[PDB]
Amino acid sequence: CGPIPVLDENGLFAPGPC
Amino acid sequence: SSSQVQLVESGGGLVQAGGSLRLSCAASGFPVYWNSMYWYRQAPGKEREWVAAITSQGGGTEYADSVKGRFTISRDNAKNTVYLQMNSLKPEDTAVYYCTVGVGVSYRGQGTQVTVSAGR
């Protein structure tokens, strides 16, 4: 399953496993 | 945080000679477009073997002679993934394939097993 929006420390999204 | 950097390879498996496979190296913790990345392979006993590289930005791609014309390295900047297209697979291609990134500080994946068998 292709990457998904993952919440980072800065309250923004980055690619991560799903 | 170096901890956040993660490389995860998938796509390996069993395949007959002359067949094809697509390996994925899914990256998190950094942007693939801005970091040169490499595929390596490691068969048991034998020494590690570099397979291909994709330079950051438009710097291009490079391949080990053994794989030139057979393998293709590519990058999806959005999905933050690097691929290794494998065609015309031989038995000497059997190995664990893993990706790496970084100059001075190197990171790497665990790898995905690729086995190539000969047929009738």
What is the rounded CA–CA span in Å between residue B102 and residue B105? 5
The total number of structural domains that make up chain B: 1
Q: How many residues does chain A have?
A: 18
CB contact under 8 A, B80 and A2: no
Any residues with CB less than 8 A from the CB of B99 and at least 6 apart, and which?
B7, B9, B25, B27, B37, B38, B39, B40, B82, B108, B109
Extract the tokens encoding B2. Answer: 């170096």
Beta strands B95-101 and B81-86, pairing class? unpaired
Nearest alpha carbon to residue B102 among B43, B51, B53: B53
Tell me how the structure was determined.
Answer: X-ray
Extract the tokens encoding B8. Answer: 């995860």
CA B61 and chain centroid, separation? 12
Total beta-carbon pairs less than 8 A apart between chain A and chain B? 19
Any residues with CB less than 8 A from the CB of B73 and at least 6 apart, and which?
B39, B52, B53, B54, B61, B63, B82, B83, B84, B85
Domain at B88, CATH number: 2.60.40.10
Structural domain boundaries, residue B24? 2-117
Nearest alpha carbon to residue B55 among B74, B29, B30: B74
- Which residues does chain A have within 8 Å of residue B29's beta carbon, measured at their own beta carbons? 14
Q: Distance (Å) from the C-alpha of residue B77 to the closest C-alpha of chain A?
A: 11
Q: Distance (Å) from the C-alpha of residue A16 to the closest C-alpha of chain B?
A: 6
Gaps in chain B (C to N over 2.5 angstroms) fall after none
Residues on chain B bordering chain A, Cβ-to-Cβ distance under 8 angstroms? 8, 26-29, 79-81
